[PDB]
RNA sequence: AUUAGGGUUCGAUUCCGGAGAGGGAGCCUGAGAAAUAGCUACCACUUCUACGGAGGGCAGCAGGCGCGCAAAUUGCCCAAUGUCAAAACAAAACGAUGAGGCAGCGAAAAGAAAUAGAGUUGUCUUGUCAUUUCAAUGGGGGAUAUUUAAACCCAUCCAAUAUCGAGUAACAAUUGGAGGACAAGUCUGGUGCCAGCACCCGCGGUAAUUCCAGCUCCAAAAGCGUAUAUUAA
């Protein structure tokens, strides 16, 4: 055992270009032998941005990372959109919330249900 | 409700609960292979009974029967791949001669002990459950892991283990922390 | 007559269980039994003489 | 089937006799089914005659077949 | 001797059907007379109220006073005799206590030297009688 | 389910089919209903009222009350699977959905799997006993974090400059048994046909292989008894 700085390497598989949704689809697996814990998604996003030479790191969407039993590996799914505008248009709201730019949470669904059921008794401007 | 995840049992209890010959024989196996409970032996018993039941059905069929050819080939392939039968014996009749020690010798606990990585079968058991044994660079913590012949040469200490190429274990680390405080 | 219910159990002198070191559990216990029975007419609980 | 009764008007009852196999006892039973069949006046079947019947639309409460051929 | 003909299935079916009623276990399993006579009504257990503590003498050659209680079932208001199954456990029982009663192991048949007793007490006041006997739980109230 | 084979038995319950929406009837609209979170009437039950009057249908989901031997949260969400629909997603601009999914509870059942491992010296080759020394690991505490709709589990880690922890490892395994069937005591106290055990045969009336206890031993083991059905026997 020799102490050394923990360095992660990014490998992609099952790569596909999805021109319908203006993005690239692939499976990303990370080898982190001496990493203490789990590799945060932000670091993997930066390394994928450097690897694929996409101009902006925020164009990369990552999710569903599973750490392999025993350590040293982590496999997830990645998306690289053609531009940031395309990522904001096509990504689901919860993934955009993880990346930072997401819609504010809606009010509790029970409150909406109760308001809707009260209005069904009303009629006109009162509703 | 509306969950379709199948599951099945893997062992059965013996018909006669108190048979001194069976109790002594099972006590021998438990001590010899370091087994936790009789359920591990009975799990091996069901595996053997299913294999022999399949073999007896196939051996009934004519030797040129397509089902016998396909499934007989698969059964022999499985026995050879997992080391139950040696490569010398290739007939379907040799599957019927398999015994409980044949399967138990293929457990990772026995293989680790026989390989010299452990001093005893009990040392092998705790080594496996403590994430020290790796098969093809993959840490295996299951003692009942049946080792294939191909994977037998790839068994060694885990790279993340203190006995392999990993950091120091708990007692050394705690002692170092105490020394730093002291 | 229902009056003598529990007569013997109440008559029995109370003796507390002795404090003893714990036995091993699980696999280690079977190792102990294997070492006692083997690697060492057979009587498993042969007792001292009495009358 | 075989003609069983010709008592109705332009209608006959035929009987289809068959063997039903009981799996447990590996043996057969004799069973029969009776059908009401419309008989055209083109035929004059008698009891015991064998006829060929074809399926048609419901012509009455019980009639679903028509006599197509009579074999003495 | 029996029929053996190739087309003699109906005879064999009728013969077996007629002779199955000779089997007491089969007849009981396919007739409601035992179910209607069963105080539990086909249930594994039943809950009842203790009416009276009684002493049932053991049958010869045994000689003892088997401590039993008279129980009226909640479901159908039928009276049964149930045995209290341990040493001194009759003191855990009181009149008007709610007890859980089970079978005695022989499926409606009297068990042991106890005359015509086919039930035993397993819980009293919603706590296991054997747990009280071993002092693993305390009698409520 | 059980099963050499033949059979025996279960199927309210996820999929398909049918039927019902307290009990009956009748009907409108509509392509399709004899619809019930549609209407009409009667019966039973029942709610509000200012007494003139007006309502209700959980065998949907949660929840109650009863009934019973007997069966969870008045939770979160539409992220996935679908359905409907004027509807792709986005942009002041987020469709509904107790279908469904996710968590809570849950020893029905199923899978894996801890409760220690290596020696040291001495004592009574192996094997016991004492002590005595090394490592190792989880249970658990946490995190740059990961997961997830969000959380929670599971996985990863205890430095990557830099990260908590076993010795009585008190982090202490139980459930039944020890005459026979049936594996395991001709042990020691107590009781004395009593108390009690005992599925059956039987034990107990002063020296109990069977009760109540203690010790020791046996079987299965995170499981083990009991009752009732059922299959084999
Ligand atoms: K949805
Ligand atoms: K004695
Ligand atoms: Mg059904
Ligand atoms: Mg019913
Ligand atoms: Mg249901
Ligand atoms: Mg309907
Ligand atoms: Mg209706
Ligand atoms: Mg409703
Ligand atoms: Mg109505
Ligand atoms: Mg409900
Ligand atoms: Mg229950
Ligand atoms: Mg639902
Ligand atoms: Mg932990
Ligand atoms: Mg989950
Ligand atoms: Mg014996
Ligand atoms: Mg004595
Ligand atoms: Mg468990």
Could you characterize the architecture of this molecule?
- Chain B is mainly α.
- Chain B contains seven helices and three strands.
- Chain B has a three-stranded antiparallel β-sheet with strand order 2-1-3, with no helix packed on it.
- Chain B starts with 19 loop residues before the first helix and ends with a helix.
- Chain D has strands spanning 2-5, 11-22, 27-38, 50-55, 63-71.
- In chain D, strands 1-2-3-5-4 form a five-stranded mixed β-sheet, with no helix packed on it.
- Chain D is elongated, with a radius of gyration of 14 Å.
- In chain E, strands 1-2-3-5-4 form a five-stranded mixed barrel.
- The structure holds potassium ion (2 copies) and magnesium ion (15 copies).
- The structure holds one RNA strand of 233 nucleotides.
Give helix and strand order of chain E, one letter per element, not per position. Answer: HHHEEEEEEH
Number of strands of chain E: 6
Bound molecules: potassium ion, magnesium ion
| Coarse structural class of chain A | alpha+beta
Amount of helix of chain A = 25-40%
Q: Largest chain-chain contact?
A: B-C, 11 and 10 residues
The CATH architecture category of chain A equals 2-Layer Sandwich
Euclidean distance between termini CA atoms of chain E: 69 Å
How would a textbook summarize the main sheet of chain A? Answer: 4 strands, antiparallel
- For the terminal residues of chain A, how far apart are their CA atoms? 72 Å
Strand content range of chain A: 25-35%
CATH fold descriptor of chain A: Alpha-Beta Plaits
For the biggest β-sheet of chain A, the strand order reads: 1-2-4-3
Assembly state: part of a larger assembly
Number of strands of chain A: 4
Helical residue percent of chain E? 10-25%
Rg calculated over all Cα atoms of chain A = 21 Å
**Beta fraction of chain E:** 25-35%
Whole-number count of domains of chain A: 1
PDB class: ribosome
Keywords: Leishmania major snoRNA Ribosome, ribosome
Entry title: CRYO-EM STRUCTURE OF LEISHMANIA MAJOR 80S RIBOSOME : LM32Cs1C1 snoRNA overexpression
Chain A: 40S ribosomal protein S24
């Amino acid at each position: 055992f020799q102490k050394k700085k923990a360095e992660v390497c990014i490998r992609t598989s099952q790569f596909k270009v999805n021109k319908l949704l203006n993005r690239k689809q692939f499976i990303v697996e990370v080898n982190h032998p001496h990493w203490c814990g789990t590799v945060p998604t932000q670091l993997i996003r930066k390394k994928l941005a450097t690897l694929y030479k996409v101009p902006d790191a925020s164009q990369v969407s990552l999710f569903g990372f599973k750490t392999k039993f025993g350590g040293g590996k982590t496999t997830g799914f990645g998306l690289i959109y053609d531009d940031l505008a395309s990522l904001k248009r096509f990504e689901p709201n919860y993934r955009k919330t993880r990346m930072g730019f997401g819609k504010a949470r809606l009010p509790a669904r029970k409150s909406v249900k109760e308001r809707r059921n009260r209005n069904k008794k009303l009629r006109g401007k009162a509703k | 409700m509306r969950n379709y995840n199948n599951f099945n049992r893997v062992w059965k209890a013996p018909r006669r609960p108190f048979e001194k010959e069976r109790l002594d024989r099972e006590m021998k196996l438990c001590g010899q292979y370091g087994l936790r409970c009789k359920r591990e032996i009975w799990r091996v018993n069901m595996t053997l009974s299913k294999m022999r039941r399949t073999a007896r059905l196939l051996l009934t069929l004519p030797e040129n029967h397509p089902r016998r050819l396909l499934e007989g080939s698969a059964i022999m392939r499985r026995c050879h791949e997992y080391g139950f039968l040696d490569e010398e014996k290739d007939k379907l009749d040799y599957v019927l001669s398999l015994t409980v020690p044949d399967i138990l010798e293929r457990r990772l606990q026995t293989i680790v002990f026989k390989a010299g990585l452990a001093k005893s079968v009990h040392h092998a058991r705790v080594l496996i459950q403590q994430r020290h044994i790796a098969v093809a660079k993959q840490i295996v913590t299951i003692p009942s892991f049946i080792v294939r012949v191909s994977s037998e040469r790839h068994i060694a200490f885990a790279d993340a283990s203190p006995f392999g190429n990993g950091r120091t274990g708990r007692v050394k680390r705690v002692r170092a922390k105490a020394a730093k405080r002291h | 007559s229902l009056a003598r219910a529990g007569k013997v159990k109440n008559q029995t002198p109370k003796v507390a269980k002795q404090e003893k070191p714990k036995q091993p559990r699980g696999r280690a216990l079977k190792r102990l039994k294997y070492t006692r029975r083997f690697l060492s007419k057979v009587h498993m609980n042969k007792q001292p003489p009495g009358k | 089937g075989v003609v069983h009764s010709t008592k109705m008007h332009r209608t006959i009852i035929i009987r289809r006799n068959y063997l039903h196999f009981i799996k447990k006892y590996q043996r057969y039973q004799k069973r029969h089914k009776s059908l009401a069949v419309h008989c055209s006046p083109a035929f004059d079947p008698k009891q015991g005659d064998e006829v060929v019947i074809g399926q048609c639309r419901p012509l009455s409460k019980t009639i679903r077949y028509n006599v197509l051929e009579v074999v003495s | 001797t029996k029929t053996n003909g190739q087309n003699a299935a109906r005879k064999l079916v009728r013969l077996r059907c007629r002779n199955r009623w000779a089997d007491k276990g089969w007849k009981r399993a396919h007739t409601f007379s035992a179910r209607k006579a069963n105080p539990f009504g086909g249930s594994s257990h039943a809950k009842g109220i203790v009416l009276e503590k009684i002493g049932v003498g053991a049958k010869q050659p045994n000689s003892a006073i088997r401590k039993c209680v008279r129980v009226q079932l909640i479901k159908n208001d039928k009276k049964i005799i149930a045995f209290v199954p341990n040493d001194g456990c009759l003191h855990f029982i009181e009149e008007n206590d709610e007890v859980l009663v089970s079978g005695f192991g022989r499926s409606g048949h009297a068990v042991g030297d106890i005359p015509g007793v086919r039930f035993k007490i397993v819980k009293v006041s919603n706590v296991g009688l054997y747990a009280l006997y071993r002092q693993k739980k305390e009698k409520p109230r």
